Curated annotation (Swiss-Prot):
Subunit of glucosidase 2, which cleaves sequentially the 2 innermost alpha-1,3-linked glucose residues from the Glc(2)Man(9)GlcNAc(2) oligosaccharide precursor of immature glycoproteins in the endoplasmic reticulum (ER). Specifically required for the cleavage of the final glucose. The subunit beta retains the catalytic subunit alpha in the ER. This is Glucosidase 2 subunit beta. The lineage of its organism: Eukaryota, Fungi, Dikarya, Ascomycota, Taphrinomycotina. It is found in: Endoplasmic reticulum. Heterodimer of a catalytic subunit alpha (gls2) and a subunit beta (gtb1). Disulfide bonds join C52-C81, C66-C93. The N-terminal conserved region (G2B region) is required for the interaction with gls2 and its translocation to the endoplasmic reticulum, whereas the C-terminal conserved region (MRH region) is involved in the recognition of N-glycans bearing from 5 to 9 mannose units.
Length: 94
């Protein structure tokens, strides 16, 4: 009944703190981008989050290429209130 969290990667982009719980969801300060729904490849998709107001539901898509450590490289609202999260992590290698 309790969601399991990952490593919690947090980074300040645009003045707000992006938190990637990885197996839960992603936030910006306290504004919920999206929620972990599915893992597609090595990319995790988070949607049904907090409203965007200027569009549909916010969403977050974490693109992981794997690396030495987990870190939020960048986040970009390029898609429909859907935030591209660019990351890497050794735990992503499989």
């Amino acid at each position: 009944y309790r969601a399991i969290k990952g490593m919690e990667t947090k980074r300040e982009i645009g003045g707000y703190t992006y938190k990637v719980v990885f197996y839960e969801n992603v936030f910006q300060d306290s504004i919920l981008l999206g929620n972990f729904a599915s893992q597609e490849g090595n990319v995790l998709k988070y949607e049904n989050g907090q409203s965007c107001a200027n569009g549909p539901h916010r969403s977050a898509i974490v693109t992981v290429e794997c690396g030495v450590e987990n870190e939020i490289v960048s986040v970009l609202e390029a898609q429909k209130c859907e935030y591209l999260i660019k990351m890497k992590s050794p735990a992503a290698c499989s």
